[PDB]
Amino acid sequence: DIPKDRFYTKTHEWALPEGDTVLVGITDYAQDALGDVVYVELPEVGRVVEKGEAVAVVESVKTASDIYAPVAGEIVEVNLALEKTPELVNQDPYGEGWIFRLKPRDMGDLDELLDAGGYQEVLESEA
């Protein structure tokens, strides 16, 4: 399951472009590997983050996973619903399970990410 409406990351993350921003969450593959999610550490809104910086932690019943900032920019929103219902990450990783909204320091940076095809090659490469 790899929708082609967003960018992807080798660290199994996605960035949904929406105007001058991008929604961020983990891939279906990512939550399958993690198992039931029980808690999500969210980054403070307004922080300026650099590309690759660990800014979120998804805690499941198997391990804790550091979520990185696909590209440099600022956190403009955090998915509060993940505090009361973390499992949304499993149920709908690409939808209601988004983690944070990030505004790229520069959109052109997204063009350095992978597309549905790039991410699939990656999953098949490490199969």
Short mmCIF file of C-alpha atoms in Angstrom, two decimals:
data_model
loop_
_atom_site.label_atom_id
_atom_site.label_comp_id
_atom_site.label_asym_id
_atom_site.label_seq_id
_atom_site.Cartn_x
_atom_site.Cartn_y
_atom_site.Cartn_z
CA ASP A 1 0.00 0.00 0.00
CA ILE A 2 1.80 3.07 -1.36
CA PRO A 3 -0.53 5.90 -2.47
CA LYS A 4 0.99 8.05 -5.25
CA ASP A 5 -0.35 11.35 -3.91
CA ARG A 6 2.70 12.13 -1.79
CA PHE A 7 6.49 12.11 -1.45
CA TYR A 8 8.30 9.35 0.43
CA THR A 9 11.39 8.89 2.55
CA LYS A 10 13.95 6.08 2.85
CA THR A 11 13.15 6.25 6.56
CA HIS A 12 9.62 5.09 5.71
CA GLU A 13 7.86 8.44 6.04
CA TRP A 14 5.62 10.46 3.75
CA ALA A 15 5.04 14.13 2.98
CA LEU A 16 1.64 15.18 1.66
CA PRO A 17 1.98 18.47 -0.26
CA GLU A 18 -0.77 20.99 0.51
CA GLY A 19 -0.07 24.53 -0.58
CA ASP A 20 3.24 25.76 0.83
CA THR A 21 3.25 22.94 3.40
CA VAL A 22 3.33 19.14 3.71
CA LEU A 23 1.58 16.73 6.03
CA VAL A 24 3.92 14.14 7.55
CA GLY A 25 3.33 10.60 8.74
CA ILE A 26 4.67 7.06 8.57
CA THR A 27 4.04 4.61 5.72
CA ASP A 28 1.68 1.61 5.91
CA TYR A 29 4.77 -0.57 5.91
CA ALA A 30 6.09 1.39 8.89
CA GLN A 31 3.07 0.81 11.15
CA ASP A 32 2.88 -2.84 10.12
CA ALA A 33 6.46 -3.25 11.36
CA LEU A 34 5.75 -1.33 14.59
CA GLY A 35 2.53 -3.03 15.59
CA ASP A 36 -0.10 -1.36 17.74
CA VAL A 37 0.87 2.24 18.51
CA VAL A 38 0.28 3.28 22.10
CA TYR A 39 1.74 6.79 22.27
CA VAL A 40 3.08 9.57 20.03
CA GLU A 41 5.55 12.23 21.15
CA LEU A 42 4.77 15.39 19.20
CA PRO A 43 7.15 18.28 18.40
CA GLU A 44 6.31 21.75 19.70
CA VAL A 45 4.46 23.94 17.16
CA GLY A 46 6.65 26.74 15.82
CA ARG A 47 10.01 25.04 16.18
CA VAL A 48 12.39 25.45 13.25
CA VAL A 49 13.79 22.06 12.24
CA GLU A 50 16.52 20.97 9.83
CA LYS A 51 16.35 18.14 7.32
CA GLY A 52 16.74 14.77 9.02
CA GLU A 53 16.32 16.08 12.55
CA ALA A 54 14.50 13.68 14.86
CA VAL A 55 11.36 15.57 15.93
CA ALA A 56 8.76 12.94 16.83
CA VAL A 57 8.64 9.55 18.49
CA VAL A 58 6.02 6.93 17.73
CA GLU A 59 5.89 4.41 20.55
CA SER A 60 4.35 1.03 19.81
CA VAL A 61 4.25 -2.33 21.53
CA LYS A 62 7.48 -3.43 19.88
CA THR A 63 9.73 -0.37 19.99
CA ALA A 64 10.08 3.42 19.88
CA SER A 65 10.74 5.01 16.50
CA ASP A 66 12.30 8.40 15.81
CA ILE A 67 10.39 10.35 13.13
CA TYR A 68 12.54 12.74 11.10
CA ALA A 69 11.82 16.01 9.35
CA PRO A 70 11.70 15.00 5.62
CA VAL A 71 13.07 18.44 4.82
CA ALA A 72 14.11 21.54 6.77
CA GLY A 73 11.36 23.93 7.79
CA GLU A 74 9.01 24.76 10.64
CA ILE A 75 6.35 22.76 12.49
CA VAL A 76 3.07 24.60 11.88
CA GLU A 77 0.70 21.99 13.30
CA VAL A 78 0.56 18.88 15.47
CA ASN A 79 -2.08 16.13 15.34
CA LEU A 80 -3.59 16.35 18.81
CA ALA A 81 -5.92 13.39 18.23
CA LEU A 82 -2.86 11.12 18.52
CA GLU A 83 -2.72 11.90 22.22
CA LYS A 84 -6.13 10.36 22.92
CA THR A 85 -6.22 7.85 20.05
CA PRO A 86 -2.65 6.92 18.97
CA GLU A 87 -3.86 3.81 17.11
CA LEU A 88 -5.02 6.11 14.30
CA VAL A 89 -1.46 5.73 13.03
CA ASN A 90 -2.19 2.04 12.41
CA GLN A 91 -5.79 2.33 11.24
CA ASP A 92 -5.10 5.10 8.75
CA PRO A 93 -1.35 5.96 8.50
CA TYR A 94 -1.80 8.05 5.37
CA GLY A 95 -5.03 9.68 6.51
CA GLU A 96 -6.28 10.55 9.97
CA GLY A 97 -2.97 9.19 11.24
CA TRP A 98 -0.79 12.11 10.13
CA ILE A 99 1.61 13.26 12.86
CA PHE A 100 2.61 16.84 12.06
CA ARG A 101 2.29 19.62 9.48
CA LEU A 102 5.61 20.99 8.26
CA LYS A 103 6.23 24.11 6.21
CA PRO A 104 9.35 23.62 4.04
CA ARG A 105 12.07 26.25 4.30
CA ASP A 106 12.06 25.76 0.53
CA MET A 107 9.61 23.64 -1.49
CA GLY A 108 12.26 22.71 -4.04
CA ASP A 109 13.66 20.46 -1.33
CA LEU A 110 10.74 18.06 -1.65
CA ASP A 111 11.92 17.34 -5.18
CA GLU A 112 14.85 15.53 -3.49
CA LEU A 113 12.48 12.95 -2.00
CA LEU A 114 11.10 9.70 -3.41
CA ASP A 115 7.81 9.05 -5.18
CA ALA A 116 5.62 5.99 -4.72
CA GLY A 117 7.93 4.19 -7.13
CA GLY A 118 11.08 5.21 -5.33
CA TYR A 119 9.76 4.04 -1.97
CA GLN A 120 8.61 0.72 -3.41
CA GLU A 121 12.08 0.07 -4.86
CA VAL A 122 13.40 0.73 -1.36
CA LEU A 123 11.03 -1.73 0.30
CA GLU A 124 11.79 -4.34 -2.34
CA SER A 125 15.51 -3.63 -1.95
CA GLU A 126 15.45 -4.46 1.76
CA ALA A 127 12.95 -7.32 1.54
#
